[PDB]
């Protein structure tokens, strides 16, 4: 489906998951089809050029729903800095999903234009010995496009990242469990009822993506060894690159979202401690 993202306050930008992944798979077929032979190598600049020429145009197609989007930030900023508004949210949210569903034929064409490019380069991939096909392009590409990312994930503890997040998600829940007592009034009780619900849905997407990230970081690390200092027959080589491309694309899309969804969660926890400034200053007077 789709994924809504509030990285900074006053910033909103969506990601159609099957789309981002479809694009990435064809980017890896483009590079591996180029990096195979030593001669093709120089093509990279034109491929580099093309990816930009296709990405920029997708961003234009998505930026054509800016108004419906800018109407959403308005309905979002209103609930963050305070049924009527609760139902104002769902109608505007359901309006944005329709805008993407409207530009469906618009999106699927940029999608096919890149599939028509990437496969064209893949069809063009020749072998000198189809019996004994080289795997330099696999090693070069991985070591230059995918490896940094494996290190990048192996460095940051994505588990503590969730561990720290439930600890936060817990106290706010402990706060709302005993605030509901006979206190339910003016502490913008609905804002704490909205963000906690909003933050809980964010964590579920993070926990969903981190599993996929931790998943594919094993799969990719295991699968390279099998296809690196050797020479397959074309029939296998053709397949072997696609599998690595299929597995790269997931890792990458699902990773991109884990960083976006991380940032989106803390800008949604900025508006909790700020709306907690109220609750402390409130309760500080009662002892007088």
């Amino acid at each position, epitope marked *: 489906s789709i994924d809504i993202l509030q990285e900074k306050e006053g910033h909103l930008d969506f990601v159609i998951i099957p789309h981002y992944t479809f694009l990435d798979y064809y980017k890896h077929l483009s590079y591996n089809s180029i990096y195979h*032979k*030593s*001669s093709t*190598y120089g093509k990279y600049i034109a491929v580099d050029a093309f990816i930009k020429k296709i990405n920029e145009a997708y961003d234009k197609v998505k930026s054509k729903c800016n108004d419906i989007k800018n109407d959403l930030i308005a309905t979002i900023k209103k609930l963050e800095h305070p049924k009527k508004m609760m139902d104002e949210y769902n109608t505007k949210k359901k309006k944005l999903i329709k805008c993407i569903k409207n530009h469906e034929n618009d999106f699927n064409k940029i999608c096919m234009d890149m599939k028509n490019y990437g496969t064209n380069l893949f069809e*063009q991939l*020749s*072998c*000198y*010995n*189809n*019996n*004994f096909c*080289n795997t*330099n392009g696999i090693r070069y590409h991985y070591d230059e496009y995918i490896h940094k990312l494996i290190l990048s994930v192996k460095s940051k503890n994505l588990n503590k990242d969730l561990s720290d997040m439930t600890n936060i998600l817990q106290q706010s829940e402990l706060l709302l469990t005993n605030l509901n007592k006979k206190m339910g009034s003016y502490i913008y009780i609905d804002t704490i009822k909205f963000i906690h619900k909003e933050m809980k849905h964010i964590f579920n997407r993070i926990e969903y993506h981190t599993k996929i990230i931790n998943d594919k970081t094993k799969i990719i690390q295991d699968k390279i060894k099998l296809n690196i200092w050797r020479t397959f027959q074309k029939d296998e080589l053709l397949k072997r690159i696609l599998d690595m491309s299929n597995e790269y694309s997931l890792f990458i899309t699902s990773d991109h979202l884990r960083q976006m969804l991380y940032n989106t969660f803390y800008s949604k926890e900025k508006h909790l401690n700020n709306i907690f400034h109220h609750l402390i200053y409130v309760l500080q007077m009662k002892f007088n």
Partner: antibody
Amino acid sequence: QLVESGGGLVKPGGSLKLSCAASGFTFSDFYMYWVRQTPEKRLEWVATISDGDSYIYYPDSVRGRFTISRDNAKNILFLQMSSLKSEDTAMYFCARDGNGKDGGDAMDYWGQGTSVTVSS
Amino acid sequence: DIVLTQSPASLAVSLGQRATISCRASQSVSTSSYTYFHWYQQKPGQPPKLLIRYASNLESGVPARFSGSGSGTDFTLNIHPVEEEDTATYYCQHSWEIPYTFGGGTKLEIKR
């Protein structure tokens, strides 16, 4: 077209460098070969070099005795000959691989040849 | 190491008749998709010139009379009608394995 130079008379145990001047085409797109033709007309494959020098193949007959190299900048093919036997006496041809999409193409263009002769 | 056996070694042929050269390989040089084999022509005092590309993949400049055939281990180069511009040593080659092997040779000969 291709042109072989560097042949002549070497005593057994000696060394010799053979060059090939590639023209009419984009040298660094093609895999390159060396083929000898003995006086009794037998064709014996000598060496294969990839477009960007990364892959090199030699028959067990010439293993570690001969060295194939290219200078894609100067558009030249080189066969180093070291510690030669009389057995190497032959017409040394340099040749372009076909560069077929589906397959392991033939020796499409063949140079004129250079005579090597290993006799004391 | 693959070995390519050409039958015959020499061949006597009257002008206009049929000429048949057969190459036999130790290992199969084919795949249900490709056939890494090739025929050349070697006119006296000249380098071998590429005659047939794969099985029958004739060359841009090779007449209608020439026709190479086969798959796997057994191949056949057919020349009909034979003319004077045909007297040459014929060599079959393989591009299948690491040891790229050539054939023995087949000297065509016009019977007068």
